[PDB]
Amino acid sequence: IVGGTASVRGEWPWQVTLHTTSPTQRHLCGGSIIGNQWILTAAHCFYGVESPKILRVYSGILNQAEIAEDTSFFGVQEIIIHDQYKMAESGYDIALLKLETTVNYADSQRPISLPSKGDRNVIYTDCWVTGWGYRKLRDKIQNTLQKAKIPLVTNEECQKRYRGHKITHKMICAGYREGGKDACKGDSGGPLSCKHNEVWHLVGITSWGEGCAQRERPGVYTNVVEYVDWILEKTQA
C-alpha cells in the first residue's frame, strides 16, 4: 500500500495473508474471508503455483512478525481459478481458495459481506484498500498491515487513463487524480472494502495498475458484484 498508514489490529478482520512455502516461506498475496472455508482472492496470484500444498493462509494477522514456524495456519484444499482468466489486465482476475479446515470466527477474523446486485447503483464514498504490499514501486513486503482510503473513479474515467487497455464493466478503479495513495506489489488479492450503510462490502479485489500511485493511473480491481453468481456456483458443493 502506497501512501497509507498502519492498521489497528482487528480493523480489517476479513483480510488474510497468503503465504507460499517454496523455496522458503514468504507473503505471496492478500485475500478475503467470505465464508468459513472460503477465501476470495486474485487468480493471477497463482502464477507458477503447481499445487495448493505450498500454500498457507493466515487469518487474524496484523504484523507479519506474528507469523513463525509454530504459528497455526489454514491449509488450502483447492484453488479455484475462473475459467475465463488469462491475465489480470484482461479481466476475470478472481479465484477461490477452499480451505482444508474451517475458520472459527472471532473479533480478529470474520467474513466480509459480498456486494448485492441491487447495489450496482450505490456510490460508495468510503472505500479502503489494505495489504502488506510495497510502500513504493521498488520496495519489500511490509510487516504491519497498511490501509489507505481511496476514491472510486468511473470506468469511463479509468479507460481514459488506460487507453492501452480495455477497462470492462467487470473491473472497477480507484485512485487520486494526482496519485499518492494506491495498492502496490504484494497487495494483490487484497480486498477493496467500502463501508455503506454501516456495513463493509467487498467491492473489489486488488488486481493491477501501471506502476504504483502514479498520477492519472488509478489502481484497477476486479469488480466483485459481477461475480456473485460465479462465487455462489463455485462455493456450492
Q: 82 catalytic, yes or no?
A: no
* Separation of alpha carbons 79 and 18, rounded Å: 12
Nearest approach in angstroms of CB 37 to ligand 995 is 24
Out of 208, 226, 227, 231, the only residue in the binding site for ligand 995 (CB under 6 A) is 208
- CA end-to-end distance (rounded Å), the chain: 35
Q: Should residue 179 be labelled a site residue for ligand 995 when binding is judged by CB under 6 A? A: no
Cβ–Cβ under 8 Å, residues 18 and 55: yes
Specify the residue for cell string 497468503: 18
Query: What track of x and - describes contact with ligand 995 for positions 68 through 97 (by CB under 6 A)?
Result: --------------------xx--------
Query: What track of x and - describes contact with ligand 995 for positions 182 through 201 (by CB under 6 A)?
Result: xxxxxxx-------------
The nearer residue to ligand 995, 14 or 221, going by C-beta atoms, is 221
Q: Should residue 133 be labelled a site residue for ligand 995 when binding is judged by CB under 6 A? A: yes
Annotated catalytic residue: which of 188, 193, 201, 207?
188
* Separation of alpha carbons 76 and 73, rounded Å: 10
Neighbours of 230 (CB within 10 A): 16
The nearer residue to ligand 995, 37 or 188, going by C-beta atoms, is 188
Q: Should residue 43 be labelled a site residue for ligand 995 when binding is judged by CB under 6 A? A: no
Tell me the Cα Rg of the chain.
Answer: 16
Annotated catalytic residue: which of 19, 27, 32, 44?
44
Q: 229 catalytic, yes or no?
A: no
* Separation of alpha carbons 199 and 220, rounded Å: 23
Specify the residue for cell string 474451517: 102
Phi and psi torsions of 214, nearest 5°? -75, 150
Tell me the window of 58-66, 179-187, 196-204, 227-235 that interacts with ligand 995 (CB under 6 A): 179-187
* Count of chain residues binding ligand 995 (CB under 6 A): 18
Nearest approach in angstroms of CB 76 to ligand 995 is 17
Cβ–Cβ under 8 Å, residues 180 and 5: no
Q: 72 catalytic, yes or no?
A: no
Tell me the window of 12-20, 71-79, 150-158, 209-217 that interacts with ligand 995 (CB under 6 A): 209-217
Cβ–Cβ under 8 Å, residues 103 and 59: yes
* 162 labeled part of a ligand binding site: yes
Q: Please provide the size of the chain in residues.
A: 237
Specify the residue for cell string 488509478: 218
DSSP H helices, the chain, are 155-161, 228-235
Which residues are at the interface with ligand 995 (CB under 6 A)? 44-45, 88-89, 133, 182-188, 206, 208-210, 212, 219
Task: Summarize the annotated binding site as residue ranges.
Answer: 160-163
Task: Summarize the annotated binding site for heparin as residue ranges.
Answer: 160-163
